[PDB]
């Protein structure tokens, strides 16, 4: 919820469908309460097509949110000690090619649902590229 936050991304790249591949985020400088916790996952987004939400976790009590294209496939994970978080995605499908973007929102109470809109994530990383080939 800090101003000098940085999300730093790991893996990525390509494969053919039905493979798997991994992706990593660390939201380092992140401060905020103990009274409250937040939110971080994946957005992803195909040439030409608008982003879409991926999966997101929240900290602390591990809510997980996965959009209905990915369920079965993908799983979202968090390691409280090393403050990363992680997405394994299996059997990857030419529709799940695109860049990959980390994001993490404002805290707030553990009583709010982990939230998935894009409208609703205030710290970006840069982007990582998944493509499935044929
Ligand atoms: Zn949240």
């Known amino acids: 919820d800090a101003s000098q936050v940085q999300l730093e991304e790991s893996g990525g790249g390509s494969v053919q469908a039905g493979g798997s591949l991994r992706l990593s985020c660390a939201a380092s400088?992140?401060?905020?309460?103990?009274?409250?916790?937040?939110?971080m996952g994946w957005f992803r987004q195909a040439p030409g097509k608008e982003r879409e939400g991926v999966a997101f976790?929240?900290?602390?009590?591990?809510?997980?949110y996965y959009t209905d294209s990915v369920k079965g496939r993908f799983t979202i994970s968090q390691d409280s000690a090393k403050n990363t978080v992680s997405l394994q995605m299996n059997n990857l499908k030419p529709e799940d090619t695109a860049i990959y973007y980390c994001?993490?929102?404002?805290?707030?109470?553990?009583?709010?649902?982990?939230?998935?809109?894009?409208?609703?994530?205030?710290?970006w990383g840069q982007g990582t590229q998944v493509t499935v080939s044929s």
């Open positions: 994001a993490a929102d404002f805290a707030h109470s553990f009583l709010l649902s982990v939230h998935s809109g894009a409208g609703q994530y205030s710290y």
């Open positions: 976790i929240k900290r602390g009590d591990h809510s997980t």
């Open positions: 400088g992140y401060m905020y309460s103990t009274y409250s916790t937040y939110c």
